[PDB]
Design a protein around this ligand. Structure first.
Ligand SMILES: Cc1cc2nc3c(=O)[nH]c(=O)nc-3n(C[C@H](O)[C@H](O)[C@H](O)COP(=O)(O)OP(=O)(O)OC[C@H]3O[C@@H](n4cnc5c(N)ncnc54)[C@H](O)[C@@H]3O)c2cc1C
Ligand SMILES: Cc1cc2nc3c(=O)[nH]c(=O)nc-3n(C[C@H](O)[C@H](O)[C@H](O)COP(=O)(O)OP(=O)(O)OC[C@H]3O[C@@H](n4cnc5c(N)ncnc54)[C@H](O)[C@@H]3O)c2cc1C
Ligand SMILES: C/C=C(\C)[C@H](O)[C@H](C)/C=C(C)/C=C/C/C(C)=C/Cc1nc(OC)cc(O)c1C
Ligand SMILES: C/C=C(\C)[C@H](O)[C@H](C)/C=C(C)/C=C/C/C(C)=C/Cc1nc(OC)cc(O)c1C
Ligand SMILES: [Cl-]
Ligand SMILES: [Cl-]
Ligand SMILES: [Cl-]
Ligand SMILES: [Cl-]
Lengths: 213, 579, 580, 75
């Protein structure tokens, strides 16, 4: 917010606006912005570069939506945090890396359209899985014994559960069909598992998430 | 002596002919149009209008009338593959640039969106706009019989179908817009290269409230397969009026009897496709017709030019037919106007063929491939002939299983689904065609290209031949496209800061040729502003350079900087193919 | 031989209706122009408001007719011309207005495709601007002040100020449009002094909101003209309807004495409540303006390559509402003429015809409005109002108007004769639509001008006599209904013909070769062209079936021929029209 | 969403001289720009919108009062 406030003054500065200038001087500097000089060329560059910085407040998609919890009510899966060449303040990158906000995808339940965000949250832990994810059932029941906390198991694209009509969730989930993404009531990812292999880890995982003894 | 003398005779009053009538109207060229049928189309037929048609409709000043009636883009947001309408779904993609991954490109590419307006509504609009303009004459119920042409003109024989009387029309030029199996194109001795009746179709127009089945997944095309049918027995629902008015297409095998009039059998077939027997279906029309896939190798002979279905036919996949016809007529008419004024040689008219004939080859090829692509979906599911309803339900059921067979079926479906982009999001084909030869002068630079599929992805360029890039300009507090401030029956030279030499070269162009070139500077000389800097980014010339735009919105020529100003007069003489 | 900042075919000084209409014409014909306006914004207060049938028509040719009808007051809610005491008090006399009265409505409907409507300058002006910035053919610089010009055989050079930056630049034009309003800078520059008089009286317009629907809905009118009892004749209040019945203008006419205060939003508020006569009425002032009623017309409209339109060349009291209308028509007379000079298709002889045609119209309207102002006092004078009467003495002159006396019969007589004269401004159909150019861009056919015994100011009489506005008839082109006035104009010459008029095809071909100008041949009720469903056009065209009526881009007749015998004369006629 | 200005009406971030005067610079805003709108639509079921605090606060109160689980004491 601070940096974005600083950036705003850049716009008038670019134009060469200063103190002790008359209306008539400033109307001139606007008029003489489109001149073919060393002066106006340098101004025009500075305006387009000062303009560019404003994206940091008008399209700060990565700050708005892309923050991730690196420590807290979650269990890292040992994978490195995804990252790319792009400025991480401007550009959001959907990931199920634990601590991130669960990626949005359009699912369909019967003929009802819902996001991955609508079928999770709402006061419960939810475990998203897919074909071959039956093992998660037992693991969830075991977890509710060990911990007292219920984990709703929601298979997407299998066993008559919600569908993934576009394939988007299969692209974004970054686990295998048989894996699992464990979603907290706040919509962030507590934990993830590549495949059903990891199913036995869940009771433990839920215990660490709740910081239970 | 002829009964009538008129500059241009248009044979046929469908999209192609009516577009030509409109363009000639706006250009003030007197013309006569004859149409065999006493009325416009009575059933919907073609319906998807693409962004390029939008732009042409803006240039011709009927976009607003069209938009008022048409289904908007967002209600065509998907392309659906399903079993029955009421049964489970098979696959879905975004369509027409509605998916997140395409929408940015579709918005940046054109001032116009895509929309859905069926022929029986679009034709009256074009008729009305022609009548209002009062420059040319529409004659419904008049059938072209034959023509003879010479060095000076075309003599056509016409039948009034009410009176039975024949009469003759002498015209300078004749436009063949008379649809598939063109009498005009036959009279020229041009034969179509391709195939006829590659398949048969039965299109039912009907009413029925299917919103319970469609509102939650809005689409133009819902493609179904009734469990227990061979893969080739696809059922296609086309949304005409969300969600109560539809077409339904079946593709009966060659060994089959189609009774258009058996409304009972047609209705039970539609109920079976819907998969709900309680749905009231009102039949409005049933038509049988033959899918062709052919293109004329020559579009023109002497003083006769053929447009639209006359010179290209293909399956309705991609919806390129109507759009292409509109663009065919929009390519030709400005060229005629200049010829009639003596301001252009017959060399300019030859460029109609040169520029549009490659585009017909492209659309026919694209449409064909997209048709073939459709069968890949039921094939991917494991569907074959000689299967009960039960086996096919089981294959749908088991698609989501945790087995090797299921995993491969899912992978094959994915790949088959992915190919359907070549019909639902074929942005490169729709907007991205570039004339490589014709009424244009190369600048020497190489045609731009990249590693992306040039059918799917549009790349804006001012490379001579390309459609002028869209950019939002501001003229005062009015927002307008680059495309709005060009076109309109005139040549426009777009320039910017330092472009003052272009004023006198355009003045010299006009002395040498007789053709006014409007000089319009952008972000200079008090001209329209480039508020977001888009036009600077896309013009691909320096500030002092220029882009010369044809009356059809295609780039005729470009120049990096003002050091080329002196070549403008010569460029205009080459484009105008003047001696 | 300095260096001009800007080369441009036409410079238009002043961006009011005159100005903008000219830009929009020049826009539609595709002529590169520049317009400069001394004020930074368009007009901010109502001022002019009544659009007459001919403005209607011109708007359709320029193609902003719909855009204008959308915002406008329809002509039925201008049904009357009301003379009253107070707006809540008794009424004095009334007549039908703007052809809403039974004995005129026939003539008003037959006369034009367009009707009369109400749109205040502050709403209009924008729409004109919009249209111009959409066409993108010429350029609008607000905050640029014309200073001076020089001209020669080859063009005009014009010194301009940018009022923001303070810098001066220079425009070189071929031709220049003096559209700069009352007290024309441009017309000064040319050395042409207006004939007439300035400041003949003073007025105070109060644009204000107030729900008077109780007092106005049951007798709809543009113009309510009251005398508050206890006031001298000249102290007429005038209410004008702007947005029925919540928005309004109020006009007073302060005597030569009277110290006037624009700013005093409480004194003005008290005057209005007095005029209404109902002290409980909420009155929200939005503007108050002093201004001076003038009565003058330039004896020349043009000098060399410089041409003046609108208020620059005619000023008058707002009676008859001719000023705006005439300014539109001025601009529309002229533009099509510039285009054809710019393309070397017409000599300077064609630009001389702007003065020849529209200057007599300036004389006519200025006279008509003055007379119409003079009549307004006839009403309160008939009632036997004068100076130095109490409120209680006037109330009695109103009360005893409807009495069985010999005083009352004769006062009702004089009231009816004064009332009868208001037709001059309320139903002035011949002034509005019936003006004809007797010399200019036209060839007389040798027929004497039509006359009749009806007052030519009140009664329009349709004719195709060269110089007249083409008569309106309803045509049908397929299933599309259009006027003769729709299938003509639009930047080109049209020849209307009929059965047996095939010879006009070749005549029109030959005229285009010889002169370079295209004549479009439109047969009516023949050759499969537009039909004449009621046969009206056959009635009004005053030529035989095989004959022709040559219509200018402005919708006035340039020439006519009884029959196809005359086909041969057309090349030379178009030559003569174009002043080649 | 009922009471709020939808995202498409916050399409730009404008730099100007005066509101009726000339403009100085302009970028798309809140993902309305063609080069951002794709990521913005893909990223959330929800769009951006505009609803001032004096309108939002009562809706929150209202839904709290309707739930009737806890207690608001103002003042
Ligand atoms: C179900 C279906 C869906 C389709 N979907 C689409 C779509 O979504 N988008 C799209 O862009 N395209 C689509 N197409 C294609 C579209 O219908 C055509 O490509 C389009 O009609 C081309 O127009 P045209 O004017 O060249 O020909 P036509 O519509 O065939 O019109 C030619 C006219 O000339 C007349 N004529 C013929 N002979 C004579 C004669 N001797 N004298 C006078 N007149 C004569 C005919 O009466 C006819 O009115 C579709 C087609 C079908 C059947
Ligand atoms: C209260 C009132 C009521 C009226 N009633 C009616 C009616 O009902 N119907 C009707 O038809 N007519 C009516 N008239 C007449 C009508 O208002 C005017 O005749 C009309 O506005 C004239 O327009 P114009 O283009 O000649 O000039 P203007 O309206 O004077 O516009 C000229 C514009 O240019 C600008 N300008 C001025 N000087 C310069 C300069 N040197 N350089 C650049 N720009 C300049 C001004 O800001 C102005 O906006 C009425 C007039 C008034 C005042
Ligand atoms: C599943 C197997 C099928 C359907 C058939 O056996 C064969 C393979 C396909 C054929 C004969 C294709 C016919 C063309 C078709 C169904 C196009 C879809 C279409 N696309 C538009 O694009 C805008 C507009 C439209 O009106 C329509 C109807
Ligand atoms: C009763 C006596 C009075 C009012 C004065 O003393 C003298 C006689 C009148 C003068 C100085 C000016 C009158 C101008 C006027 C009120 C015209 C009415 C008008 N007619 C239109 O025609 C459509 C449009 C309009 O906006 C208006 C306002
Ligand atoms: Cl339009
Ligand atoms: Cl098609
Ligand atoms: Cl209009
Ligand atoms: Cl007036």
């Amino acid at each position: 917010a601070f940096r974005s406030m600083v950036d705003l003054i850049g716009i008038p500065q670019a134009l060469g606006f200063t103190e002790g200038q008359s209306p008539e001087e400033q109307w001139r500097l606007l008029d003489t912005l489109h001149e073919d000089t060393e002066e106006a060329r340098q101004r025009r560059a500075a305006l387009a570069a000062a303009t560019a910085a404003i994206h940091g407040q008008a399209n700060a998609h990565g700050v708005e939506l892309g923050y991730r919890y690196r420590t807290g009510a979650l269990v890292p899966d040992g994978t490195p945090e995804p990252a790319d060449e792009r400025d991480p303040e401007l550009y959001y990158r959907a990931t199920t890396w634990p601590g991130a906000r669960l990626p949005h995808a359009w699912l369909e339940n019967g003929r009802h359209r819902c996001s991955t965000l609508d079928v999770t949250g709402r006061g419960r832990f939810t475990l998203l899985t897919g074909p071959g994810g039956e093992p998660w059932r037992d693991a969830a029941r075991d977890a509710a014994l060990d911990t007292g906390v219920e984990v709703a198991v929601l298979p997407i694209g299998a066993g008559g559960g919600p569908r993934d009509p576009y394939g988007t969730w299969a692209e974004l989930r970054e686990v295998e069909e048989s894996g699992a993404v464990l979603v907290r009531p706040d919509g962030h990812v507590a934990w993830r598992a590549r495949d059903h292999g990891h199913a036995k880890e869940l009771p433990e995982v839920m215990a660490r998430v709740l910081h239970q003894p | 002596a002829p009964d009538i003398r008129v500059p241009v005779l248009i044979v046929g009053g469908g999209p192609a002919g009516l577009t030509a009538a409109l363009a000639l109207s706006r250009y003030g060229v007197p013309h006569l149009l004859v149409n065999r049928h006493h009325g416009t189309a009575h059933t919907p037929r073609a319906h998807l209008l693409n962004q390029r048609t939008g732009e042409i409709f803006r240039d011709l000043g009927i976009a607003d009338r069209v938009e008022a009636h048409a289904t908007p883009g967002h209600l065509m947001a998907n392309h659906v593959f399903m079993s029955t309408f009421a049964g489970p779904e098979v696959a879905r993609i975004g369509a027409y640039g509605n998916g997140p991954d395409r929408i940015g490109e579709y918005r940046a590419a054109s001032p116009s969106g895509l929309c859905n307006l069926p022929q029986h509504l679009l034709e009256p609009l074009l008729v009305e706009a022609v009548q209002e303009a009062c420059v040319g004459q529409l004659r419904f119920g008049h059938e072209f019989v034959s023509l003879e042409q010479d060095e000076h003109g075309v003599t056509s024989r016409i039948t009034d179908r009410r009176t039975g009387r024949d009469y003759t029309v002498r015209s300078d030029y004749l436009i063949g817009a008379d649809g598939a199996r063109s009498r005009v194109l036959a009279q020229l001795g041009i034969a179509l290269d391709g195939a006829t009746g590659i398949a048969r179709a039965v299109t039912t127009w009907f009413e029925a409230d299917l919103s319970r089945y469609s509102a939650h997944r809005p689409a133009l095309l819902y493609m179904g397969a009734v469990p227990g049918s061979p893969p080739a027995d696809g059922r296609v629902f086309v949304s005409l009026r969300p969600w109560t008015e539809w077409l339904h297409l079946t593709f009966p095998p060659p060994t089959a009897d189609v009774d258009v009039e058996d409304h009972e059998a047609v209705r039970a077939g539609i109920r079976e496709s819907i998969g709900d027997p309680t749905v009231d279906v009102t039949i409005k029309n049933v038509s049988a017709w033959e899918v062709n896939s052919a293109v004329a190798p020559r579009y023109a002979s002497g003083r006769v030019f053929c447009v639209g279905d006359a010179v290209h036919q293909n399956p309705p996949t991609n919806g390129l037919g109507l759009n292409s016809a509109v663009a065919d007529s929009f390519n030709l008419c400005w060229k005629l106007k200049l010829a009639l004024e003596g301001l252009a040689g017959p060399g300019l008219l030859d460029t109609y063929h040169d520029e549009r004939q490659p585009v017909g080859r492209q659309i026919v090829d694209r449409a064909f491939r997209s048709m073939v692509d459709l069968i890949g979906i039921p094939q991917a599911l494991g569907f074959t002939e000689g299967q009960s309803p039960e086996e096919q339900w089981r294959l749908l059921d088991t698609l989501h299983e945790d087995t090797e067979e299921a995993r491969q079926r899912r992978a094959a479906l994915a790949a088959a689904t992915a190919a359907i982009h070549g019909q639902a999001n074929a942005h490169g084909v729709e907007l991205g065609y570039r004339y490589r030869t014709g009424a244009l002068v190369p600048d020497g630079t190489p045609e731009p290209a990249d590693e992306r599929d040039p059918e799917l992805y549009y790349r804006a360029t001012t490379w001579p031949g390309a459609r002028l890039p869209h950019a939002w300009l501001e003229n005062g507090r009015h927002r307008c496209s680059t495309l709005d401030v060009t076109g309109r029956g005139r040549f426009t030279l777009l320039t910017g800061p330092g472009g003052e030499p272009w004023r006198d070269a355009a003045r010299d162009a006009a002395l040498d040729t007789g053709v006014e070139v409007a000089v319009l500077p952008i972000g200079a000389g008090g001209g329209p502003r480039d508020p977001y800097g888009t036009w600077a980014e896309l013009r691909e010339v320096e500030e002092s350079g220029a882009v010369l735009v044809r009356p059809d919105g295609h780039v005729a020529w470009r120049a990096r900087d003002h050091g080329h100003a002196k070549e403008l007069p010569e460029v205009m003489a080459r484009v105008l193919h003047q001696p």
